[PDB]
Design a protein around this ligand. Sequence first.
Ligand code: ANP
Ligand code: MG
Ligand code: MG
Length: 421
Amino acid sequence: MNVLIIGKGGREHTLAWKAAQSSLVENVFAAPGNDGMAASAQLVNIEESDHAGLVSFAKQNQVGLTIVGPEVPLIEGLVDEFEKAGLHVFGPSKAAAIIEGSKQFAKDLMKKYDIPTAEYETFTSFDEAKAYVQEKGAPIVIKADGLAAGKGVTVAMTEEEAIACLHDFLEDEKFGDASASVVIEEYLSGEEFSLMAFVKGEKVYPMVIAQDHKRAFDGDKGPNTGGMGAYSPVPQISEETVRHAVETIVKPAAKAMVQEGRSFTGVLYAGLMLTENGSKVIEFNARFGDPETQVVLPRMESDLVQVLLDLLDDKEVDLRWKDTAAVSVVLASEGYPESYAKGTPIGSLAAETEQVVVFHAGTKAEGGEFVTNGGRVANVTAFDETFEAARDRVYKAVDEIFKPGLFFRKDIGARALKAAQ
Ligand SMILES: Nc1ncnc2c1ncn2[C@@H]1O[C@H](COP(=O)(O)OP(=O)(O)NP(=O)(O)O)[C@@H](O)[C@H]1O
Ligand SMILES: [Mg+2]
Ligand SMILES: [Mg+2]
């Protein structure tokens, strides 16, 4: 079989890396893929945005399973297009991807179906949105309804901050239609963790959970990023917490979507906050997480491709997890998340340390070597039998391949390991 992985980030590298291990698979194609992936995937020069070429390529190249990585094509209905051409494709229809594409939709689903989440309301009027902020006071969380570059969320510590954000989103239409509607919701805290599941209609096959660091700097200080590192398991979260999340959030969410005529197939990603009142949904994503995939997938004992094919063909899914631990650290370009420059030479990015995989997020092969090609550059990912050893191993690996234009957080996983004990 030929498998197509769509996209170009670290999640897709992980996907291609895992698929490559399948006994079922003859070719793994990655469109567009990136140069970090060439050992695991034959790169196919088509953009995740180029839906017609993607569909036409898969159709004509005997691609028996397509796995979609990024959210935008899913949200824009790439799966419908694949299926119109009779291609076998894993991921949600445009109707189902709304659970990520429209935060208001997601909050309303949970309201309707008693799935626990932050108390919220949605607005299209600045005046009414501002009044509600002044009523609730700070802290309060302001979210653009649509994707908004991934920049649509402000956790406001003051009313002024919240109202300025509402100004941007609504009066200035900062993100256009994505911010023509806003969700205003309760600030939560506690342990934040990711619970993904393979889902088809009502069937839910949970994955091991992960946790990430979104803050640029150690001590979780500084601006937000697209993720500075992650790990699975999350030591300080019980198995009971996870199983309860699976039972009262993920499965009910999957059921709800069927009952809404938006039957969901793909990875349902639940971003959860373990509060003093228990898990509450911070967000839903309609696809594999980044950077979570990088520590979750490698823990899979099962063959990803077999799982997906069984799931899609309504067969028994035999999905097994390893006890091992995975921990990854992001190398980002100096300056990210603000301004950064592409082109810095950063070497081979090859580790000697064993049980390490570097998933490339923003690299380009240039002159026998790798240069930086984005803010977050690689996810150095180490596996081991305990959290703490995986933790120690990944930082061996990192120093080894570290280079001038890069930074990274040194404390990935340490608060977790500590709070566990
Ligand atoms: N209700 C809330 N209370 C507290 N923090 C929140 C709340 N909603 C969101 N956040 C925080 O805002 C960040 C989430 O913003 P978001 O854009 O959803 O992040 P993300 O992890 O990049 N999601 P995605 O881009 O889909 O992978 C996290 O640091 C959350 O913990
Ligand atoms: Mg999201
Ligand atoms: Mg079988």
